[PDB]
Design a protein around this nucleic acid. Structure first.
Ligand SMILES: [Mg+2]
Length: 87
RNA sequence: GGUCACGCACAGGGCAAACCAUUCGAAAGAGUGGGACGCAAAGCCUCCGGCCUAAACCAUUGCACUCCGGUAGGUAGCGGGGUUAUCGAUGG
């Protein structure tokens, strides 16, 4: 089931993409070296983030540690990605 | 002559990119002044397509690595279209 990338759901949509990335990095950088964080604000990709880790284990840690985490008021929803595509 | 096209000019000349100052804006961007990259409509209008912004309301819990809600604003110097205008190469 597990994956290098984690999928974050239910994020506050009123936050700029600019800031959101930086906030997600500060929160998640404590578990491993993030390769990149993908955040779009299109109709489909609103309130959503992909955080690609160095390791799957480091990605397994962040999921098991910050589930439901109150983040910009709203609680985070984390689950593994379905495909780990990209270099 | 006039009309409809056209730009190898000629006459009057016209406009003003970037950048800087200042104002407005949530932003894209616009206004004014300075300033010239260029432009035969780089005068003017968002009807159509593209692109840029996303503060407020509406909608949306959505798995991406083409990119895409409504909504409003912007770009006419991104295209198309519409409309008006100078000269007139023994010009077509
Ligand atoms: Mg001026």
């Amino acid at each position: 089931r597990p994956n290098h990338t984690i999928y974050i759901n239910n994020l506050n949509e009123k936050i700029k993409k600019d800031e959101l990335k930086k906030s997600l990095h500060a929160i998640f950088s404590r578990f491993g070296q993030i390769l990149d964080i993908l955040v779009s604000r299109s109709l489909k990709m609103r309130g959503q983030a992909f955080v690609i880790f160095k390791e799957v284990s480091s990605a397994t840690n962040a999921l098991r540690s910050m589930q439901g985490f109150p983040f910009y008021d709203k609680p985070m929803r984390i689950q593994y990605a379905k495909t780990d595509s990209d270099i």
